[PDB]
Ligand binder design. Structure first.
Ligand SMILES: Nc1ncnc2c1ncn2[C@@H]1O[C@H](CSCC[C@H](N)C(=O)O)[C@@H](O)[C@H]1O
Ligand SMILES: Nc1ncnc2c1ncn2[C@@H]1O[C@H](CSCC[C@H](N)C(=O)O)[C@@H](O)[C@H]1O
Lengths: 122, 375, 227, 375, 227, 122
RNA sequence: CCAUGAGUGU
RNA sequence: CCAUGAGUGU
RNA sequence: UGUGAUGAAACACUCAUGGUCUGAAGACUCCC
RNA sequence: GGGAGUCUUGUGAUGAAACACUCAUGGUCUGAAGA
């Protein structure tokens, strides 16, 4: 895919999915591309998760632009089916956002700091 | 570890302490600096930076921009970025001075004289890259069309009120504004009406007789040619406007298929243009959620509901879509929501340069519409 | 008529033909006006009439601005220069020694900003997005005053981002808070408190809070010192 | 004493009890009755009434209309009137019946058939005399004029926003809309501008070079011939409308000096017409107090003051008068109050058919104005 | 769909495809509508949908008009017939036997009144000023009902004046009170009261007073009997 | 004069000027053509008095028209200076109106009923 | 700007 | 519809 | 059916009629 | 400060919120159920 800016190791990708699940239970998340869009526009999201297997590509391509504008960090997962079914859906999702980490605070803070390292940030 | 700076002044290397390890001064030339400033936007390093990264041989280098990092990794170095680092600050604290020290200019006097004309020239360049965008011509065109639409209606309502001083029955006899105007333009006085001239407009033989009888028995006022010609000025302007609208329509169609084929595929050229006009640009249209695109053009209705906690509008300019306003009130909500959803997909494939996919989108849409209508 | 200095540098008041009092600045480019403002000569020196209804800075001054960090030879970063109405007056103040870098990302409007910046060596126009200071990083220096008048929901966050880039320690930031462009639903007075708090968390030292009403509706301007 | 009734039915005489002393039935002819009803409005007695006043030879007659009274006095009788007399009611109480008794029709069926078509023809006639009033065309003219005024501005504002994609520097260089319009029309691309074609408009050479220099150094976008020709439609239409406007103003001047010279003498055709449009007719403007004429066109502002006891408008559409909007703020109130006074007199001498007296009216006004300005 | 008679002559209600209830009258000129109203056949008889929002009489009924003095074969004087919207429905009601005289002084509007009155033998158009009943004195007869819906400051006085000309003793008058066309300053509820008193001093016997809201804002209609 | 519809005898004319005078003292009047016009449009006036020497005449020609619409009775006097100097002005007046008669009700009632007789009203 | 009655355009 | 900045016509 | 289900006030105009400011003061000069 | 006149003025002195448009920026519904 071309809207995927960097490479996510599957250990990270899995630790991502887990952070989402804890946030459904203890915090507040958003599911779907349109609500993720509003979550970035509104500055509610702390972490934005976008799928790498979206068809067609352009559906979620605006999220990198939007997220850098509002300087909200974003991360990718390999499967959209997995991310949606993580979100508490039995259907896929192209992108989601965590608004309140809750009992994923430590978990998220490590992700947003690891994805910084692979982004070449000091 | 060497901290690297990029500026109009050139490229400077710093240690973590804030001392110039080495520098390579830029040429004092408007043309060349402007281009590297534009280029640096995309990640491309200054040519002065490359020379500098060769003189000093640093194991770990750190730059200001995150877009430069992959370019410089490709050049052989281990590279990262720190956005608002202490070093970058240290550099600019001494920017009145260090222009002279690394001899970019002789004194402070004509550093700013130059820096000014660069700034003038740098934005002058950006001013042009903005105007050259294709979607802007689309927006102005359709805005002007709606200006003509508005004018056609006003002049037509005026002409009917005006001409009916002479020939009142003609008003209720011709529904179409363009048709009505055409009668007043070509004939003038009501007693100048003749059958063949009317067959030429498309009038069926039956109506021609109803019109001709009405002019015969008209209880209107007898009026001078001066009076009539006044009216006919307005009548003729109406017809002019109708032609110009259609010419604008064809022009719009071309531009809309050029700049946004996918969106055009879904709702047609005009409404596509209209949505571009409300968003401001295509790239701004793309970044929108479906829930916004759905109500664009209904700002009075929308912000009332947000202020008072009342009911929101179902549809904005999206209402013009044939399927919606033809449909009953309860189906409109679902059709608009579905359209806006598909529109958002159309906009994004358009903006992020995707090739045409409108056919499947339309097919997907017409499916959902049919599902809605089967209840 | 009479013109006289005020407590703040290069800012003057006029005694008028009738006895009204209006603000003015020493015209850096005599015989030429940037908006419709009046030109006034007194003792053979020309001043530009500073309409407060248009310029928020003039409003805040007419509303009791304690101290003005904009004076002779001041280096200012100006986010949201727009048509150049206000920035032209700060051009008069800083007076050739001082420099003003005007950021503005709307091309339709930067168009006439160009015209102002041509006649005025004080001003360095920049057609750019104030959310990405990396794009004008390579033209500006660090500054004494960070003047922020941008219509944006995250305007306050933007200002802070720009500050830690270009605002000197012990430098000042004038932040115009546009309530209705932050949130049309919330009470303007709620927004002010929450925005100033944001500044106080990013170790800005709130000096003064002014309400621009009646010159500007639902607006406030903050003067604070960065640490 | 004989009570006289006049009706479609004919002309009937009654005693004070309400018994038919004598009658003369009208002819069952649409043409003659319609004309006699119209004539009766001016006071003219029915011809059937004249015959009846001969048949009976009455000492004291009393009619329904006070307008008839002097007419019948000229005819030789002593006459008075009672507006809603008991006798007049008696006749109309028995009017379904007594139509048949005096043999106007055989039965009720085709009395009403006649009266229905009398009414149709009676109002058809009145409908026509309303359309024949000359001030209507004056009104319609200024209304179209104001439509063109409005459209010109809209189109010009559009064209500038649009054409400035190609040649932005041109907008602030040419103040006047028609001038701007002509340039976009004749040339198109900025690189087609030439000294000789531009000298032809009247441009002093100093401005031409400034135009040409701006076109040479333009940071505008390079754009296709389709894009430019699209814009040129509006430019030509703007130019069209200015011509039509100048034609209409000349027509309006013609009709206005005709229908209301004194008002035209005071405020000119356009503003004069404008006031007629607001009043509704010339005769309605005539019946108005100056205090109304002064605020016509400021209804939003006016009733704002009346509901709340706030400040009233100094002036309505009257603001357009040169003396007012050019004068300082404190003089405007008095100028408007003075104008309105004279306008009201002007309207009345105009409507009640006076010959031109505008010269002294203007002189009186400018006297009053000159006094105001010397303080 | 279902149509059935109401408490009043020639006035019907409709059960609809969905279950809504709208008033209607029997079409005097079948297949022809004076405005945009629905034409409805039920058991092969055509009715005209009577929009209350347009017609004050339909409003007064839907607001509980106790009794209607306009029925089969009634003679009515209708001051201010205008475009013919309401009067066309009373045409349906009185039904050829009855007669309706429409006074209206606005030619721009009588223009379209004509069209309604050609198709309907019931209605006798008169372009005249209701302030001068002498001018149509010579065309009409006396009547049972005086329906007055005229926009005039002294509308009530006009009605009373017309009454003592043409209104049969013990006839009924429906007088529409336009508060805002009597005075936009005064309170509508004050106006209704002062005008009804005008009728009572002029010995009309106030029977019922209806408020037309929401069908017509700042409007009320009075039913009274002339003596 | 042409706006003068009927003929007023000096005996009647004098009872008018007196009737106006008592109405200044005990009732409410309006003085001037514009205020008289407003008084008739508003239907406040009980009696309208018009001068016979107005120049130009058309200034007040509309009052007969206005008075018949709103059915307010009108009367003529011979001098405009006389009507004004009655009204408590030292300048002329072209027309005036009595809104409230006061201590002239009986006097007014005779005028409005005598001008009826010369108007041929039964 | 209020009310009433009649209509128009995307 | 709200707020800010730049303008136009009668 | 999260690639958006459910709920849910699209925008621009014309004509006709009525409601249409205040009401007697302002400016100068000459005598001790 | 007292007195005294002159011109303008109910054919209107005094007081007093005329109307119509364009551009640019931001604030731009709901969210898991439906046959
Ligand atoms: N994110 C952003 N980056 C740069 N400019 C922005 C911006 N968001 C809004 N603006 C601009 O900020 C301006 C605010 S209007 C400010 C007016 C000006 N300061 C004066 O007083 O004269 C607008 O013109 C808008 O184009
Ligand atoms: N003085 C008057 N004499 C006769 N009609 C008048 C009048 N003043 C106003 N009108 C008319 O009265 C109408 C009031 S609207 C009422 C329309 C009609 N009653 C209906 O419901 O269908 C207006 O159209 C107006 O033209």
């Amino acid at each position: 895919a071309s809207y995927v800016k960097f490479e996510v190791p599957q250990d990270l990708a899995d630790k991502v999915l887990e952070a989402v699940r804890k946030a459904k239970e203890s915090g507040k998340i958003k599911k779907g591309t349109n609500e993720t869009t509003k979550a970035v526009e509104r500055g509610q999201a702390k972490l934005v998760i976008i799928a790498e297997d979206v068809q067609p590509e352009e559906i979620v391509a605006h999220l990198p632009l939007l997220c850098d504008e509002k300087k909200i960090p974003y991360v990718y997962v390999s499967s959209k089916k997995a991310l949606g079914e993580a979100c508490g859906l039995q259907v896929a999702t192209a992108s989601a956002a965590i608004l309140e980490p809750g009992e994923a605070k430590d978990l998220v803070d490590e992700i947003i700091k690891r994805v910084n390292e692979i982004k070449g940030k000091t | 570890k060497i901290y690297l700076i990029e500026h109009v002044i050139g490229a400077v290397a710093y240690d973590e302490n804030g001392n110039i390890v080495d520098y390579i001064t830029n040429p004092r030339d408007l043309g060349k600096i402007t281009e590297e400033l534009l280029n640096n936007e995309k990640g491309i390093p200054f040519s002065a930076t490359v020379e500098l990264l060769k003189k000093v041989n640093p194991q770990e280098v750190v730059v200001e921009n995150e877009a430069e990092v992959p370019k410089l990794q490709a050049l052989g170095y281990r590279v990262s970025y720190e956005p608002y680092s202490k070093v970058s600050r240290i550099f600019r604290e001494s920017l009145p001075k260090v222009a002279i020290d690394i001899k970019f200019a002789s004194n402070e006097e004509d550093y700013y004289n130059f820096l000014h004309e660069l700034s003038l020239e740098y934005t002058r360049r950006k001013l042009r890259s903005a105007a050259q965008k294709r979607d802007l011509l689309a927006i102005q065109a359709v805005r002007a069309m709606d200006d003509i639409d508005k004018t056609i209606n006003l002049f037509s309502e005026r002409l009917r009120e005006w001409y009916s001083i002479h020939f009142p029955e003609l008003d209720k006899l011709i529904e179409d504004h363009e048709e009505y105007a055409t009668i007043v333009s070509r004939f003038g006085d009501r007693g100048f009406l003749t059958i063949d001239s009317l067959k030429e407009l498309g009038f069926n033989e039956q109506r021609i007789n109803r019109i001709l009888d009405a002019a015969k028995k008209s209880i209107g006022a007898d009026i001078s040619e001066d009076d009539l010609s006044a009216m006919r000025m307005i009548a003729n302007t109406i017809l002019d406007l109708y032609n110009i609208r259609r010419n604008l329509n064809n022009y719009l169609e071309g531009v809309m298929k050029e700049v946004a084929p996918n969106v055009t595929a879904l709702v047609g050229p005009a409404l596509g243009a209209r949505l571009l006009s409300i968003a401001g640009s295509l790239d701004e249209l793309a970044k929108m959620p479906a829930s916004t695109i759905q109500v664009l053009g209904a700002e009075k209705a929308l912000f009332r509901a947000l202020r008072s906690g009342g009911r929101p509008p179902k549809h904005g300019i999206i209402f013009q879509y044939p399927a919606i306003h033809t449909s009953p009130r309860w189906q409109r909500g679902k059709i608009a929501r579905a359209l806006a959803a598909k529109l958002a997909i159309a906009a994004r494939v358009d903006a992020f340069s995707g090739r045409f996919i409108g056919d499947q989108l339309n097919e997907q849409l017409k499916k959902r519409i049919d599902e809605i209508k089967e209840k | 008529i009479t013109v006289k200095q005020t407590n703040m540098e290069n800012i003057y008041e006029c005694e008028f033909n009738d006895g009204s009092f209006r603000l003015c600045t020493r015209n850096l480019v005599p015989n030429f006006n940037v908006y419709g403002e009046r030109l006034i000569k007194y003792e053979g020196v020309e001043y530009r009439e500073w309409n407060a209804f248009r310029s928020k800075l003039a409003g805040a001054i007419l509303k009791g601005l304690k101290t003005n960090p904009i004076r002779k030879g001041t280096k200012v970063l100006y986010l949201g220069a727009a048509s150049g109405t206000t920035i032209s007056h700060v051009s008069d103040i800083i007076e050739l020694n001082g420099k003003a870098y005007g950021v503005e990302f709307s091309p339709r409007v930067v168009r006439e900003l160009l015209l102002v910046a041509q006649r005025r060596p004080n001003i360095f126009p920049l057609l750019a997005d104030a959310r990405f200071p990396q794009s004008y990083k390579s033209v500006v220096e660090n500054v004494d005053v960070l003047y922020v008048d941008i219509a944006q929901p995250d305007q306050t966050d933007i200002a802070i981002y720009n500050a830690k880039f270009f605002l000197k320690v012990n430098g000042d930031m004038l932040l115009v808070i546009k309530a209705r462009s932050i949130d049309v639903t919330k009470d303007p007075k709620e927004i002010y408190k929450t925005e100033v708090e944001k500044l106080e968390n990013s170790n800005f030292e709130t000096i003064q809070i002014i309400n621009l009403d009646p010159y500007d509706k639902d607006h406030a301007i903050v003067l604070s010192k960065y640490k």
